Amino acid sequence: XXXXXXXXXXXXXXXXXXXXXXXXXXXXXXXXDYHAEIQAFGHRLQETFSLDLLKTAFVN
Amino acid sequence: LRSRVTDRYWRVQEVLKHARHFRGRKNRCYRLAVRAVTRAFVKCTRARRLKKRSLRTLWINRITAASQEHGLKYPAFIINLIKCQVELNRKVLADLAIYEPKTFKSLAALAKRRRXXXXXXXX
Amino acid sequence: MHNIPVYRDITHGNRQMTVIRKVEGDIWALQKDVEDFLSPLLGKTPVTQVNEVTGTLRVKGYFDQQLKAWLLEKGF
Amino acid sequence: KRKTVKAVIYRFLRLHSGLWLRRKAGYKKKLWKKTAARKRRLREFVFCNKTQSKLLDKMT
Amino acid sequence: XXXXXXXXXXXXXXXXXXXGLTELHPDVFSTAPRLDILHQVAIWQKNFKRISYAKTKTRAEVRGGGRKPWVQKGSGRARHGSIRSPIWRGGGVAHGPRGPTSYYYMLPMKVRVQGLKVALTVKLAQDDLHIVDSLELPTADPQYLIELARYRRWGDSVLLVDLEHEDMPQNVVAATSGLKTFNLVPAVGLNVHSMLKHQTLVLTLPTVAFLEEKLXXXXXXXXX
Amino acid sequence: XXXXXXXXXXXXXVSLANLKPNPGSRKPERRPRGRRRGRKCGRGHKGERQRGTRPRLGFEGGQTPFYLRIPKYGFNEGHSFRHQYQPLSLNRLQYLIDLGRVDPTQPIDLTQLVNGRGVTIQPSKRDYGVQLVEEGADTFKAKVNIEVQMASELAIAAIEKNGGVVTTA
RNA sequence: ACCAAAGCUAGCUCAACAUAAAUAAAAUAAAACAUUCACCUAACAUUAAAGUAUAGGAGAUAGAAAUUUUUAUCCUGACGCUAUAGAGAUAGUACCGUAAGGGAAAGAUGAAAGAAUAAAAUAAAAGUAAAAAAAAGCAAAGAUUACCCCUUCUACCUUUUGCAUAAUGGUUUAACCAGAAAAAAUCUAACAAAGAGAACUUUAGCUAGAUACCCCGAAACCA
RNA sequence: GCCUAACGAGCCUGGUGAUAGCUGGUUGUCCGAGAAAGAAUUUUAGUUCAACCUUAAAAAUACCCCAAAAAUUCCA
RNA sequence: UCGGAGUACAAAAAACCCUCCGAGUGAUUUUAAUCUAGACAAACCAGUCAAAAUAACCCAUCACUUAUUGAUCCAAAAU
């Protein structure tokens, strides 16, 4: 349909003159959970312990 | 019954999107944009074909220079490298001819050594 | 009624090919029997089966007499 | 529907197999200097060439 | 000879009953359903229903005149004839639909018959076909039909072929009134288009009788 | 075998969207638009072949036509006034006897032969006769009466030999 | 952001149903032309006979008749199209010609002016913004710097033995605009000595579907 | 010469979308193969079958070809 | 339009407003009756050779050797 492509072209052209600020909560598209992040963090790096301290480390 | 709709306008939009940075109507008008695009692609192919030639010539010039610094010419150095069973490309040889004068000096020394040994064995 | 279908297929004007249609039972076994039967006689076994929703047995030669005799005596 | 050319229908004969037949020309006149064998073989029939036979077939 | 045995479940359609037993022998069944025949039948059924009312005007049918707008040479302009020409924006199209036609064609009887037969086989082996002794709708209300379709877990689209069109008002009245899911049609009016339109088929004993009679007579007429 | 394989798996119920033709059923009609054949639409460069005014068929280009150089005969004269007679083989007849068709003498006639789909329709044939040309007559079945317009010598021979009756009208 | 596009609605085509007189030509086709020419002026229903019987510079083409077969109303619209499409039509007006006659262009705010709600502001054209160190360029690419000089390359199309050619066409942009015919055949399916919905064909045929033959232009002739 | 600003025969409308073998034109992708001359024609700027070519199938064999022989014509 | 000799060197074919000569027939004697294979040449259409069988008897020379003609439809001495 031409309406969806005109709307997509208008949104993509509207984002050029307007730049929205980066948001931390809406950053990731999928749902962000603590356990998912620390799990991947444990799978990537060699060894990871103290999940509570790890979560606390990213807390400000 | 069909319609022209957005098809032609999108094709023109694409061509003009590829026609950016061009000078004059060629970055504006569609036809001149296409005419310039064809030439641009032909020149892309041709220059990408001759790029190896230009780089090769440049490398040959550099190696010729570095060789002439040691008292011998380019062809003699090439021959000596061939009889020395050296398959080293002229790119790396030029890189050594720039950054590492010691290696090229060693190769030139071995070159003059092989040349003098051949000239002494022939006599 | 008449016993079995027999299809004489013409691919071109002067060119002729034989075509059989599935009747009773599965086509594979009968095809194997056709191969084993035509192998000593013809010397080769160029048997090909074309199956969409039904099937077609195609060979190179004219066996149609032996075809009719076989499918008669068998009863299929 | 198509109209068959009568010019072909009169002097040509098509068989059931699609073969065309025509009379040999030249028997009509000036037979005085001609050999009797020539006339004899010109009184018989002859089959048309396939190329022209197809053309005459399309007209019938 | 392979005899197919199909179980006919008799439903008294009041509620909560799936229990019924009748032994049916649908010799109409075919081994492999033909997709090509079905497709050709569908395409044809779509074809003879075309009105072919598309119309336009060729340059000869244009109201405009055939006068030359200017001299051929010396004018400085391009060579041009009447302004009703297709090259002119005041003209029409030459290849246009304007010339009428008929998109239908005559399909062999054996083809369409084998089409309905094969389609019936498709609906049969797909478990979407059910056979009943009769049909009862005492209350005759939409809610009853809906809750019946939901409780008995019938298909999303069910084609009901039962009546001979000459009787049973109580059913037809409720069945033909404001129902998208269920469709009605006489046993003598059963067609392949209607079957392919729905995902589920429900037939009664007389319907199956006349159907198998017609289909056996057509298969026997096509085999002979 | 295909019925069991089609009934075993659960398919999509074959919606109208799942209808597909067999391979090579319908041709992908060629459209002249493209860079495949440039601008001439396969008509070639110029000539009268390009134009829609191209010369009529049956024309040799101005030289004396093929059909005009051919003499005349009465081949076509026949197809008009010829007396039509259709030959029938005794093999077909004995085949009809073997098909379990009507045995007795009395009902047998051309009409019954029409109902048996064993006759040739002659709508464009005026004054249609019926003839019998002998074939497949070896050891054919016996006691069968046949009524035809004019029967050939070997036909009457073959029929009478096995005890059949030839009725000439 | 400027001239600007983008947002709707009149409107109609076609099918069905209801309801004061008197042989016209020619251009053209037969690649010339002369006898000839389906066609058109008024009456002329279906199937089949049949593109047959015949006619024709026996060339192109024209072409029946005898005879055959047929059938009751009631059931309405769109795999037709929108301001360049469909009628020309918001109209035969404005305007042109002495006259006959020829024949156009032309509306959008919002539910409500209650007159600042809208939402993009990108088509060809100039403004915000010009060339820039003694340098060459069918208008770019490889390098190179967030720009350029240097090096590598004889416009497109048409027509032709051959065109960057000082041969042809084009100011640019938008839009409009030019391959629609199945006999025999190849192919996919139905049945098979039969196919095909009372019509034809047939020593594997028959039936159905699917595959190939585009536009503009005269000088003139006739009424 | 003139007959409503151009008369070797006015203009308007209709036949008419007259006729044009000519000239100017004919739009998306990819893959395989791939043509420059035999005789005729009120014909040479056009046609009709050969000289080629392409698609889809079958049955064959074909060429480069030495001495037996008449640059080739034939064949291991 | 056609035939022969060169251009066109040891089977074909091959052009030019290149080059030599010839024909639309002339005459003398015997006379070519029916049809079966199989080939040459050949775009179409026109041109050459001919074993052998049957009925009845028992084509040939010059004009160097070959040329020396005409495909359809339509008319006539009569079939």
PDB file of C-alpha atoms (C1' of nucleotides) in Angstrom, chain I residues 1-77:
ATOM      1  C1'   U I   1      15.158 -15.110 -73.373  1.00  0.00           C
ATOM      2  C1'   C I   2      18.607 -19.184 -75.233  1.00  0.00           C
ATOM      3  C1'   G I   3      23.325 -21.946 -77.114  1.00  0.00           C
ATOM      4  C1'   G I   4      28.726 -22.454 -77.811  1.00  0.00           C
ATOM      5  C1'   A I   5      34.349 -20.620 -77.181  1.00  0.00           C
ATOM      6  C1'   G I   6      37.653 -17.298 -73.328  1.00  0.00           C
ATOM      7  C1'   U I   7      37.737 -14.232 -68.815  1.00  0.00           C
ATOM      8  C1'   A I   8      36.505 -18.754 -64.880  1.00  0.00           C
ATOM      9  C1'   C I   9      45.082 -23.420 -65.352  1.00  0.00           C
ATOM     10  C1'   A I  10      43.840 -31.091 -63.555  1.00  0.00           C
ATOM     11  C1'   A I  11      35.300 -32.366 -60.101  1.00  0.00           C
ATOM     12  C1'   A I  12      31.099 -27.932 -59.942  1.00  0.00           C
ATOM     13  C1'   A I  13      29.714 -22.950 -59.799  1.00  0.00           C
ATOM     14  C1'   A I  14      31.358 -17.629 -60.079  1.00  0.00           C
ATOM     15  C1'   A I  15      30.513 -10.813 -62.030  1.00  0.00           C
ATOM     16  C1'   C I  16      31.301  -6.052 -65.076  1.00  0.00           C
ATOM     17  C1'   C I  17      27.831  -0.813 -70.052  1.00  0.00           C
ATOM     18  C1'   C I  18      34.420  -7.485 -70.288  1.00  0.00           C
ATOM     19  C1'   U I  19      35.716 -10.280 -75.175  1.00  0.00           C
ATOM     20  C1'   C I  20      34.588 -13.728 -79.951  1.00  0.00           C
ATOM     21  C1'   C I  21      30.619 -16.286 -82.586  1.00  0.00           C
ATOM     22  C1'   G I  22      25.765 -18.115 -83.153  1.00  0.00           C
ATOM     23  C1'   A I  23      19.315 -18.848 -82.904  1.00  0.00           C
ATOM     24  C1'   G I  24      13.659 -17.926 -82.720  1.00  0.00           C
ATOM     25  C1'   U I  25      15.057 -22.443 -87.695  1.00  0.00           C
ATOM     26  C1'   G I  26      16.901 -25.090 -92.569  1.00  0.00           C
ATOM     27  C1'   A I  27      16.847 -29.953 -95.373  1.00  0.00           C
ATOM     28  C1'   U I  28      17.169 -35.283 -96.746  1.00  0.00           C
ATOM     29  C1'   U I  29      15.303 -40.514 -95.325  1.00  0.00           C
ATOM     30  C1'   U I  30      13.200 -43.961 -91.907  1.00  0.00           C
ATOM     31  C1'   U I  31      10.005 -43.281 -88.192  1.00  0.00           C
ATOM     32  C1'   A I  32      10.074 -42.693 -82.251  1.00  0.00           C
ATOM     33  C1'   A I  33       3.749 -48.077 -79.717  1.00  0.00           C
ATOM     34  C1'   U I  34       2.292 -48.952 -74.533  1.00  0.00           C
ATOM     35  C1'   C I  35       5.054 -48.493 -69.057  1.00  0.00           C
ATOM     36  C1'   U I  36       7.960 -50.855 -64.626  1.00  0.00           C
ATOM     37  C1'   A I  37      13.014 -50.019 -61.794  1.00  0.00           C
ATOM     38  C1'   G I  38      16.666 -46.854 -60.435  1.00  0.00           C
ATOM     39  C1'   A I  39      19.692 -41.862 -60.825  1.00  0.00           C
ATOM     40  C1'   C I  40      21.714 -36.568 -62.493  1.00  0.00           C
ATOM     41  C1'   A I  41      20.455 -31.550 -62.061  1.00  0.00           C
ATOM     42  C1'   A I  42      17.138 -28.586 -59.267  1.00  0.00           C
ATOM     43  C1'   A I  43      14.421 -22.575 -54.055  1.00  0.00           C
ATOM     44  C1'   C I  44       9.655 -22.940 -56.654  1.00  0.00           C
ATOM     45  C1'   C I  45       8.616 -24.333 -61.813  1.00  0.00           C
ATOM     46  C1'   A I  46      10.838 -26.213 -65.951  1.00  0.00           C
ATOM     47  C1'   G I  47      15.181 -30.153 -67.885  1.00  0.00           C
ATOM     48  C1'   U I  48      18.668 -35.350 -68.904  1.00  0.00           C
ATOM     49  C1'   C I  49      20.063 -41.040 -68.799  1.00  0.00           C
ATOM     50  C1'   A I  50      17.590 -45.424 -68.621  1.00  0.00           C
ATOM     51  C1'   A I  51      18.543 -51.933 -67.436  1.00  0.00           C
ATOM     52  C1'   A I  52      14.010 -54.606 -67.727  1.00  0.00           C
ATOM     53  C1'   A I  53       8.590 -56.628 -69.031  1.00  0.00           C
ATOM     54  C1'   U I  54       4.508 -56.753 -72.577  1.00  0.00           C
ATOM     55  C1'   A I  55       2.045 -55.851 -77.860  1.00  0.00           C
ATOM     56  C1'   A I  56       3.679 -55.539 -82.811  1.00  0.00           C
ATOM     57  C1'   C I  57       8.531 -55.430 -86.339  1.00  0.00           C
ATOM     58  C1'   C I  58      13.427 -57.307 -86.654  1.00  0.00           C
ATOM     59  C1'   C I  59      14.798 -42.499 -84.352  1.00  0.00           C
ATOM     60  C1'   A I  60      19.018 -41.360 -87.951  1.00  0.00           C
ATOM     61  C1'   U I  61      22.584 -37.572 -91.070  1.00  0.00           C
ATOM     62  C1'   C I  62      23.844 -32.847 -91.857  1.00  0.00           C
ATOM     63  C1'   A I  63      24.233 -26.392 -90.059  1.00  0.00           C
ATOM     64  C1'   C I  64      32.364 -28.292 -86.014  1.00  0.00           C
ATOM     65  C1'   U I  65      29.208 -31.505 -81.400  1.00  0.00           C
ATOM     66  C1'   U I  66      25.138 -29.266 -78.732  1.00  0.00           C
ATOM     67  C1'   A I  67      21.013 -24.143 -79.552  1.00  0.00           C
ATOM     68  C1'   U I  68      16.714 -23.313 -82.301  1.00  0.00           C
ATOM     69  C1'   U I  69      12.070 -21.637 -77.438  1.00  0.00           C
ATOM     70  C1'   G I  70       6.757 -19.848 -73.504  1.00  0.00           C
ATOM     71  C1'   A I  71       4.431 -21.308 -67.318  1.00  0.00           C
ATOM     72  C1'   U I  72      -1.819 -19.850 -66.313  1.00  0.00           C
ATOM     73  C1'   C I  73      -6.721 -18.545 -67.761  1.00  0.00           C
ATOM     74  C1'   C I  74      -9.429 -17.862 -72.006  1.00  0.00           C
ATOM     75  C1'   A I  75     -10.626 -19.323 -78.326  1.00  0.00           C
ATOM     76  C1'   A I  76     -10.769 -23.284 -82.883  1.00  0.00           C
ATOM     77  C1'   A I  77     -10.397 -27.999 -86.733  1.00  0.00           C
TER      78        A I  77
END
